[PDB]
Amino acid sequence: VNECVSNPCQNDATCLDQIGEFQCICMPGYEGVHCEVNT
Amino acid sequence: KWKVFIDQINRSLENYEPCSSQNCSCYHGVIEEDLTPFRGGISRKMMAEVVRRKLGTHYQITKNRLYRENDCMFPSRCSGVEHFILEVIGRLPDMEMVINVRDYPQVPKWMEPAIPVFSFSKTSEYHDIMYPAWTFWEGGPAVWPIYPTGLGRWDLFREDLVRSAAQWPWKKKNSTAYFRGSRTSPERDPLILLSRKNPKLVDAEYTKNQAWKSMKDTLGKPAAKDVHLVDHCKYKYLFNFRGVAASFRFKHLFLCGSLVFHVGDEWLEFFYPQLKPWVHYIPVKTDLSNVQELLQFVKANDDVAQEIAERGSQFIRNHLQMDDITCYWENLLSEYSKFLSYNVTRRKGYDQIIP
Ligand SMILES: O=c1ccn([C@@H]2O[C@H](COP(=O)(O)OP(=O)(O)O)[C@@H](O)[C@H]2O)c(=O)[nH]1
Ligand SMILES: *[C@@H]1O[C@H](CO)[C@@H](O)[C@H](O)[C@H]1NC(C)=O
Ligand SMILES: *[C@@H]1O[C@H](CO)[C@@H](O)[C@H](O)[C@H]1NC(C)=O
Ligand SMILES: [Ca+2]
Ligand SMILES: [Cl-]
């Protein structure tokens, strides 16, 4: 399963599907695993 | 000419046992069924195997305190689960469990012996134990721009949907069936294709999700704009499909007061066994082969269609409240703990989940 299909990334971040893993690339101003934190 | 469906509805109502409970006991059969594979007991060795295999996030409860391994693949989903566990932990006995926060279940039924993993969705071909999904509090899909921090807060969404339903009484709703979602299962394709062929019959369009790579992911058309669930309520007929597993869409559609068209009968959440075809919603064949006949039927039997929609709305309104979610967590974990055949000891390095 591509974990990005269920939109784990908040605040219009980009989701990258890695080997059975995901990464959220935040818009500037956001941080955290889900880009949920305001920097 | 509708006798066949009419008789099915009469039959289904004759079979129907309404839940009269004021608590989540409506669902106790689901707990009993999901724990049946573990009635011989869950050994320490079995738990070590689940943990070793990284099928989920390892939680422990001792002395009414919650502990967890460091790693959680989806922190917001762990946070949502923790919200409910912490609400009820003052009344929970000592236990430990592995809670899978991925979309897909982890324990196929042919695995012997069965090992215990909690997942939000399964089919009867899995031995995972269902739990109320994280999204009842937080961590559901972050659909930009409508749910920028993730679909959650069921308590608030309930209020918004009931208010929207009041703005769209049945007789004012639009007769074109409606769906807005992404291509998380190809089982959705026939509806989008029917919509493109017959847009007065069905308005079904693919949005994009965060895994989008090309126009293939929307069947060769520009992605549709995302539409808030409260803006679904103006439509009489709302479709629901599986995605990777079951979808969070389903519960919301009932509260519109609209008639839910539920496609397939394999992928479940814990509350689905209490929603009954023809009592609470219209069942649609997995392949959509009877969808046009069903849409003609409801249009020609609008009184019956409204009765079904009202029953489904009332069931979610009365038996899927936030308190039902908390209740189910408490009853599920209390019953599960009875099958641990050993005494749990907190693991070295597991921090406490506060507060
Ligand atoms: O335009 C949209 C698209 C999606 N969603 C909601 O976002 C979640 C994810 O929907 P999607 O179809 O992308 O995937 P699913 O989880 O249904 O497989 C579901 O609760 C949908 O109801 C929504 O409210 N409006
Ligand atoms: C839950 O409701 C059932 C009746 O539906 C009742 O028998 C039971 O005692 C109730 N439990 C609690 C704890 O209120
Ligand atoms: C009902 O909704 C459909 C699909 O969105 C739209 O094409 C149609 O014009 C609407 N009909 C009325 C009478 O509003
Ligand atoms: Ca992935
Ligand atoms: Cl996933």
Numbering used by the authors:
A (entry chain B): 453 to 491
B (entry chain A): 31 to 385
The paper states:
POGLUT1 is an inverting GT-B fold (CAZy GT Family 9018) glycosyltransferase and its EGF-like domain substrates sit in a cleft formed between the canonical N-terminal and C-terminal domains. The structures reveal the basis for POGLUT1’s ability to recognize diverse EGF-like domain substrates and for the requirement that they be folded. The three EGF-like domains studied are positioned almost identically in their respective complexes and 25–30% of their surface (740–830 Å2) is buried by POGLUT1.
In the POGLUT1/hEGF12/UDP complex, the presence of the Asp sidechain at the i + 2 position of hEGF12 further extends the interaction surface with Trp174. In both the POGLUT1/hF7EGF1/UDP and POGLUT1/hEGF12/UDP complexes, the serine hydroxyl is found only in the gauche (−) rotamer where it is hydrogen bonded to the sidechain of the catalytic base and positioned for nucleophilic attack.
